């Protein structure tokens, strides 16, 4: 019903362990973990003995812990479901304490507990904190409290009680930046679960290494990677103006954007629209929110160049609202702020490091074609549509230059195909038919040029079928089936091909027309997947469409194409779409009356 922006694989972080946080920090700094991060990992793995045995004893005595766990409530007055949820919550809290102990971080507790004050009905919060305190007392009662890790269990229970005592924490807000931009809200649990992103702020009195760290993060934001090791980052005047008391991080972002390094990376190999999307990534930390934002950017580039677009992005209200003056732009993804569903696919394909690997501009295609009806496309995306030439299964690769526009067609949806029957005439399409073009030999050759769009070598000749048809033992339909069951046909159209692409190209060669919808394509794919290649060839030759169109004594021929096929078959444009205006009069040349 509507075109798809892509559903990429996302892994939302529910919490942080100790190793995940350290690796997140080292990764977000683009470096090997250093000696203190090394000491983090090694010290936590050293305490792992005590942590695992704490979790062992707590899981072993969980039944008695939650059995032991203000005005005590009545079972009958509270309700059976509410009593069940009280016991479930209590066992759940103990489980998450053991989870935190093994993970070495209270991030799971703090994320999953801090905003629970009113989720639990808040008239039983005194009962809740008394029960949690009694669980703390009992867990320490059978875990000896002199100087052991019972201090650790006390601290983790205290952190759980402290998180639960925190009242209503305000949801974070990604406010709409324009009339076309929707505002979004964001729970603080989702904010605290999200991966910590370093906020590189450059102040004039920072030490040199901290400044160089901020410069390196600026390179990683803008140029997508660290270029400082290379001699291409020779920008000694911008760096030097940036380091001391002047030329702040915003001016430096602009200087990085207008540099020819940025043009070589993200403007020279791209058309304007893809370049605009990448600039949105590199200067605001987010993709295009809406079509109208892209209209503003595209018109601005059209009359003033791309450097003015960089100037407008870093001079925008949103830039000063998020990154201010001396904060490096950072990527605003899943847990950093609230995400919109509008650009979910394009923006998650843009935040990925393989965003320059795509040339076709993902945002504008999705945003425009959502406000348009369904496109003329094979039901399993446009990569399944081969190139309408005489021969050769030429499909768009999913990896090499991904130009993918996924679209959901219904099962009953049918493709519009441009037939050659209504077009042209008769005795114009009966020159490409080759029934029984009366010589047998010509019919063998034309059956080849249908089955393999060009004449084949002698090793690819199916000479036994030639002798059979010259003797009248088999008819044209059986010969075409034998050619389509030859080994070289399998190599040409079945082995080195995606299976539904293989089925579609065999359908185009054996039927002379693309498939219509998921009925046909689903049936062929199911046949060739549960039964195989020769079964699909037999089912396509014995298909009722083959019998109605090509019968038994007629070589298959192309009958229908995609409209893209005719657009390829008219590079000068179509014949007569509206009467031309040869020798016209325009104002200005007329006004000089």
């Amino acid at each position: 019903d509507r075109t798809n922006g892509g559903s990429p694989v996302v892994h939302p972080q529910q919490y942080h362990t100790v190793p995940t946080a350290v690796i997140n920090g080292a990764h977000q700094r683009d470096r090997y973990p250093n000696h203190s991060e090394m000491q983090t990992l090694s010290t936590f793995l050293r305490t792992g003995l005590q942590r695992l045995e704490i979790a062992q004893t707590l899981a072993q005595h969980a039944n008695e812990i939650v059995a032991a766990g203000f005005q005590a409530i009545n079972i009958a007055d509270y309700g059976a479901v509410r009593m069940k949820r009280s016991m479930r919550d209590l066992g759940w809290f103990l489980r998450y304490i053991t989870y935190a102990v093994v993970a070495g971080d209270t991030s799971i507790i703090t994320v999953n507990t801090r905003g629970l004050r009113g989720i639990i009905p808040e008239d039983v919060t005194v009962a809740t904190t008394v029960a949690l305190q009694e669980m703390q007392w009992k867990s320490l009662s059978f875990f000896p409290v002199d100087s052991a890790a019972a201090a650790l269990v006390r601290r983790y229970f205290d952190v759980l009680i402290a998180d639960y005592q925190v009242e209503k924490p305000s949801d974070r807000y990604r406010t709409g930046v324009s009339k076309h931009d929707q505002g979004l809200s964001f729970p603080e649990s989702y904010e605290d679960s999200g991966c910590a992103i370093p906020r590189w702020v450059m102040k004039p009195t920072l030490p040199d290494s901290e400044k160089d760290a901020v410069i390196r993060a600026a390179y990683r934001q803008v140029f997508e990677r660290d270029i400082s090791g290379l001699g291409t980052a020779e920008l000694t005047q911008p760096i030097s103006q940036l380091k001391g008391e002047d030329g702040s991080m915003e001016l430096f972002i602009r200087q990085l954007g207008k540099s020819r390094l940025y043009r070589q990376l993200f403007y020279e190999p791209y058309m304007i629209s893809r370049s605009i999307e990448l600039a949105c990534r590199h200067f605001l930390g987010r993709g295009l929110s809406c079509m109208e934002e892209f209209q503003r950017y595209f018109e601005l580039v059209a009359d003033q160049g791309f450097s003015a677009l960089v100037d407008a992005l870093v001079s925008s209200q949103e830039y000063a609202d998020y990154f201010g003056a001396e904060t490096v732009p950072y990527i605003r993804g899943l847990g950093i702020e609230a995400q919109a569903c509008r650009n979910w696919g394009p923006q998650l394909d843009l935040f990925k490091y393989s965003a320059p690997a795509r040339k076709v501009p993902q945002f504008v295609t999705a945003f425009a074609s959502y406000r348009q009806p369904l496109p003329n496309q094979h039901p399993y995306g446009m990569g399944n549509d081969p190139l309408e030439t005489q021969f050769g299964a030429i499909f768009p690769h999913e990896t090499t230059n991904p130009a993918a526009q996924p679209v959901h067609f219904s099962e009953d949806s049918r493709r519009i195909l441009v037939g050659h029957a209504h077009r042209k005439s008769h005795a114009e399409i009966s020159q490409q038919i080759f029934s029984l073009q009366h010589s047998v030999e010509s019919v063998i050759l034309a059956a080849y040029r249908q089955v393999f769009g060009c004449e084949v070598l002698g090793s690819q000749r199916h000479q036994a079928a030639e002798t059979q048809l010259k003797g009248g033992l088999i008819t044209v339909r059986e010969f075409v089936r034998q050619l389509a069951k030859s080994r070289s046909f399998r190599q040409a159209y079945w082995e080195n091909l995606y299976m539904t692409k293989a089925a579609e190209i065999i359908h185009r060669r054996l039927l002379g027309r693309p498939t219509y919808g998921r009925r046909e394509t689903s049936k062929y794919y199911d046949i060739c997947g549960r039964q195989g290649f020769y079964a699909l060839v037999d089912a396509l030759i014995d298909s009722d469409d083959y019998r109605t169109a090509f019968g038994e004594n007629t070589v298959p021929y192309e009958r229908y194409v995609t409209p893209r096929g005719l657009a390829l078959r008219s590079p000068k444009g179509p014949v007569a779409i509206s009467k031309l205006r040869d020798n016209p009069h325009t104002v200005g040349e007329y006004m000089m009356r």
């Binding site: 702020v201 002047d246 702040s248 001016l251 209200q317 201010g324 003056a325």
Partner: protein
């Protein structure tokens, strides 16, 4: 190119910064001429008191050669 040395303090009136979103507001910044109009308008839109605007680079009355 002719530069503006601008000191301004731009306050936030629409958002509460939690602990990290707080950056700074009192910035002294070299501003290019071709953007200073838009930066003045932007920091007037957000509500900043502009206390110091001087011409860091270039002279006054330049008919040519100012960029």
């Amino acid at each position: 190119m002719r530069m503006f040395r601008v000191t301004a303090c731009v306050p936030s009136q629409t958002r509460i910064r939690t602990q990290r979103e707080l950056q700074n507001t009192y910035f002294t910044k070299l501003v290019p001429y071709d953007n200073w109009f838009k930066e003045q308008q932007r920091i007037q839109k957000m509500g900043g008191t502009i206390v110091k605007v001087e011409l860091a680079t270039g002279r006054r009355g330049a008919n040519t050669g100012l960029a």
